[PDB]
């Protein structure tokens, strides 16, 4: 089988920048190299075929070049809707094979999170569990450090954190942090605080309730 290598698995660039994504085959594939875009919702579209030909309907900001083993896809000016993962595919020899993909993320101005906290629901507490949830929504850049404190001291475990993919409309991220305890453990303490540090402020983001 033909091995296709996309050495760079992710790229971050500003709106307007030019970017290049590159693919190397294990053999001469005689220009039978196609490029696909998969948006974060999962829809896969053909962008370029036979190295450099644009598929019907694809904007002229996309181009491609290459020969032998080495191929490139280029976007002349990045736009907001280009947030996606891009894959190459050789069509020289069956079975068709694909590169590993390159995920493209788009810079935007730094943005402070909007923070919300939620105590355990009465329904969950009836069952014996107690999940406390903090949302940190619509922020940039993606790196954010979240810590939980219980009656003022850091609680490292029982915490599960999940980020959204970059939002294709505004380029922000959002994340959830859930602290899960038993009801019995939850009832031993009063103050629950989620504290996040992010480049948009020198103070932590602090959101707390008392049980």
């Amino acid at each position: 089988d033909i091995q296709m290598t996309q050495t760079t698995s992710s790229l971050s660039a500003s709106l307007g920048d030019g970017i290049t994504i590159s693919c190397r085959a294990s053999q001469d594939i005689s220009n039978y190299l196609n490029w696909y875009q998969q948006k974060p919702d999962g829809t896969v579209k053909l962008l370029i075929y036979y190295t450099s030909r644009l598929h019907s309907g694809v904007p002229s900001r996309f181009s491609g070049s290459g020969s032998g083993t080495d191929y490139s896809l280029t976007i002349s000016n990045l736009e907001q809707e280009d947030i996606a993962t891009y894959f190459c595919q050789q069509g020289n020899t069956l079975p068709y094979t694909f590169g590993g993909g390159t995920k493209l993320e788009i810079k935007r101005a730094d943005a402070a999170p909007t923070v919300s906290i939620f105590p355990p629901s009465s329904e969950q507490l009836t069952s014996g569990g107690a999940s406390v949830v903090c949302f940190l929504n619509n922020f940039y850049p993606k790196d954010i450090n979240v810590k939980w404190k219980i009656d003022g001291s850091e609680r490292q475990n029982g915490v599960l954190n999940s980020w959204t993919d970059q939002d294709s409309k505004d380029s922000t991220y959002s994340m959830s942090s859930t602290l899960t305890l038993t009801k019995d453990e939850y009832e031993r303490h009063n103050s629950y605080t989620c504290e996040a540090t992010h480049k948009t402020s020198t103070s932590p983001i602090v959101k707390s309730f008392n049980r």
Partner: protein, 215 residues
Amino acid sequence: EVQLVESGPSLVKPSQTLSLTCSVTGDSITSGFWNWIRKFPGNKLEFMGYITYSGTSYYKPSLKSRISITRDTSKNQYFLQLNSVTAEDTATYYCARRGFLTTVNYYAMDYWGQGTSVTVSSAKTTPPSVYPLAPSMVTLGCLVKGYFPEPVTVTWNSGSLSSGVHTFPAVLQSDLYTLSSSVTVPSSTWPSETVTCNVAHPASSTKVDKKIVPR
């Protein structure tokens, strides 16, 4: 204008047969090439095979002992059968056309379906426990906890609230998935008007609504 839909079970046990269907509308399978492609976790795409306009099939050699692709021209459907599955067959499964005139001779997949998830596991289904998260703009949430397998679908007010929504990716912990979803609305809309999260888990045949009530 072509549309492609993958369908079939979301959870199958090891040793059993996976059986999927691609239903093609807006075009006819008696012209062009009709392909099956899957994507493993970690974005690894694999070309499994195809069936031609005259009904001849090609299979990736590593799948040839287990795979078959057949069709029903009268219903414009084609099928994937994969025998003797293991956890390595857990993937999203796509169907795709190679028919467009301009591209067919360059071996491009010119139109793809949305894909359908299949998990291969001996574990029973576990439905999600769905919990309401109540407190100018107010943020509300639903905690969708402890289900298996993926996927679930979360909506707000049956789809009518689509802006201001974040649905966080599911994470596997202690053999079960959990996710959460938030929705932000104007303060003058809640609680005066109701906000409900809807959670479907088709693998366990479950679909539930949880109204967010002020505490």
